[PDB]
Amino acid sequence: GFKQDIATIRGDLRTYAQDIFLAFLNKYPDERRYFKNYVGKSDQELKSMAKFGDHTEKVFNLMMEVADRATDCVPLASDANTLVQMKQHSSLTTGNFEKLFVALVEYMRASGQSFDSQSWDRFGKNLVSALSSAGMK
Amino acid sequence: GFKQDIATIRGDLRTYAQDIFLAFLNKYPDERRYFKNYVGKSDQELKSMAKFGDHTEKVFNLMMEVADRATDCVPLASDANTLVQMKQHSSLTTGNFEKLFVALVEYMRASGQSFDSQSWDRFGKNLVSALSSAGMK
Numbered sequence: 001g002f003k004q005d006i007a008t009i010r011g012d013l014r015t016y017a018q019d020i021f022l023a024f025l026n027k028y029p030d031e032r033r034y035f036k037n038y039v040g041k042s043d044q045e046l047k048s049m050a051k052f053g054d055h056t057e058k059v060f061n062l063m064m065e066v067a068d069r070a071t072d073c074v075p076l077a078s079d080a081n082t083l084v085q086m087k088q089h090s091s092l093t094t095g096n097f098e099k100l101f102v103a104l105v106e107y108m109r110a111s112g113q114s115f116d117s118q119s120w121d122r123f124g125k126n127l128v129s130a131l132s133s134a135g136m137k
Numbered sequence: 138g139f140k141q142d143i144a145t146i147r148g149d150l151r152t153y154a155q156d157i158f159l160a161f162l163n164k165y166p167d168e169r170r171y172f173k174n175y176v177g178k179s180d181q182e183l184k185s186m187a188k189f190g191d192h193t194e195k196v197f198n199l200m201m202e203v204a205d206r207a208t209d210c211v212p213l214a215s216d217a218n219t220l221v222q223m224k225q226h227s228s229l230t231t232g233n234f235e236k237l238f239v240a241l242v243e244y245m246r247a248s249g250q251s252f253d254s255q256s257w258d259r260f261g262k263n264l265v266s267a268l269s270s271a272g273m274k
């Protein structure tokens with residue numbers, strides 16, 4: 001289930017983080033505009049950039065902390081607010097987050113692995129609700 | 138994105154090259170008049186010709202180099218000049234290139250592979266502009 005999925009992802013966090021993030025950019029190529037340092041770079045080029053691995057891992061680490069603190073895929077309002085208030089997220093809208101979770105769920109369903117994809121979809125929906133409540137446009 | 142798509146195509150170039158060129162010829166059958174011995178043949182007959190695959194590979198080898206040398210999907214003017222000046226292209230106009238890129242983008246959109254088709258559309262438009270700047274009719 002969802003708790004096991006957190007363990008699966010955490011076990012190889014950097015690989016899953018990179019693969020899901022690339023799935024996101026591949027599904028929604030226009031989203032690359034928010035990452036000026038990743039524009040015009042192949043996947044292998046990206047993987048050779050210190051910040052790509054470091055930042056992508058740290059994003060997914062925080063995602064997993066939020067997921068683990070949730071009750072029945074309902075995240076803490078405080079966690080949503082952290083995400084809204086981050087300077088790095090100042091120009092984002094809930095639609096950016098919606099897209100990330102659509103891509104994440106698609107990745108899980110396409111994987112040969114037994115992720116609880118329905119729960120990740122619902123977690124994403126609940127997180128979007130919480131972001132909106134915390135003031136994200 | 139675009140840069141990764143170049144790697145994807147290069148990883149199976151003969152297959153992609155033939156399938157895109159066939160998509161072009163099937164969408165625009167009268168374009169066969171620029172070529173020799175292509176009329177009156179089905180796709181499988183074309184693919185079994187001595188030089189169909191070889192010629193198509195050489196075209197797409199160069200197309201991928203032009204794409205790879207581009208910045209933000211803008212090709213080098215030297216690459217455009219080469220394409221205009223090639224003896225093999227003496228009877229072409231920019232419209233021939235426009236049609237090739239319409240077919241290429243349509244192929245990408247229909248494929249099971251996550252191509253950044255919008256970037257290929259932009260690249261095609263920028264290549265056509267560059268061909269015009271370099272003196273193609």
Ligand code: HEM
Nearest residue numbers: 031034035054055058059060062063088089092096097100
């Ligand atoms: C629940 C989902 C998300 C979480 C947990 C999250 C978390 C984070 C974290 C922890 C950082 C700082 C990384 C570091 O210190 O190196 C960061 C940076 C950033 N995030 Fe988010 N983020 C999420 C979603 C998104 C989305 C959907 C976008 C845009 C489509 C986005 C855009 C950015 C940008 C542009 C930065 C700064 C540039 C960079 O480090 O690449 N984030 N995020």
Ligand code: HEM
Nearest residue numbers: 168171172173191192195196197199200225229233234237
């Ligand atoms: C960016 C697009 C293009 C590139 C990079 C390109 C490149 C090339 C190259 C490298 C060759 C040499 C093939 C060989 O001798 O093995 C070639 C030949 C040729 N190309 Fe282009 N070409 C492009 C577009 C077109 C278009 C749109 C047409 C016509 C609709 C065309 C018509 C021809 C013809 C008639 C030849 C010689 C005969 C043949 O290969 O069958 N090309 N091209």
Ligand SMILES: Oc1ccc(Br)cc1
Nearest residue numbers: 021052055056059100
């Ligand atoms: O550096 C980053 C990697 C992935 C996301 Br999502 C956001 C920032």
Ligand SMILES: Oc1ccc(Br)cc1
Nearest residue numbers: 158192193194196237
């Ligand atoms: O041999 C050729 C294959 C594809 C194109 Br486009 C042009 C020539």
